Amino acid sequence: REMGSVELLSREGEIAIAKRIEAGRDTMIRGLCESALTFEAIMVWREELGTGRILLREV
DNA sequence: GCCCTTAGCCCCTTGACAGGCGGGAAACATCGTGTTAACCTTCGATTAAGAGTCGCTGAGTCGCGACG
């Protein structure tokens, strides 16, 4: 009943939902890469990577 | 008849295995993940041919009175 009387089958809106998810990921990445501990933690963690730490598949 | 001498049994010391639970080291069969992108975006049973009663709900009928 919830699926039918409430939810409506998204016809040709799958690509729109995918683009919305991509936009949300872009917003999250833009908010992450800013002046805060996230940029310092990602930069400090990446400093050890590349030579003696995980350079690929983890960053 | 008693004491001395010697034999047999019991006990102690060493030991050359034998293999035997068991962790380690290794070779090999599990167990939880992923990942792929060419087409359908409501599936389905199951009482319901006897019988005594518990727990709740919602319709049609009346009183009490006020305003003309």
TrEMBL record:
Domain of life: Bacteria
Cellular location(s): Cytoplasm
Functional note: Sigma factors are initiation factors that promote the attachment of RNA polymerase to specific initiation sites and are then released. This sigma factor is the primary sigma factor during exponential growth.
Family: Belongs to the sigma-70 factor family. RpoD/SigA subfamily.
Binding partners and assembly: Interacts transiently with the RNA polymerase catalytic core.
Name of the molecule in the record: RNA polymerase sigma factor RpoD
Record organism: Caulobacter vibrioides (strain NA1000 / CB15N) (Caulobacter crescentus)
Section of the entire sequence shown: 120 to 178 of 652
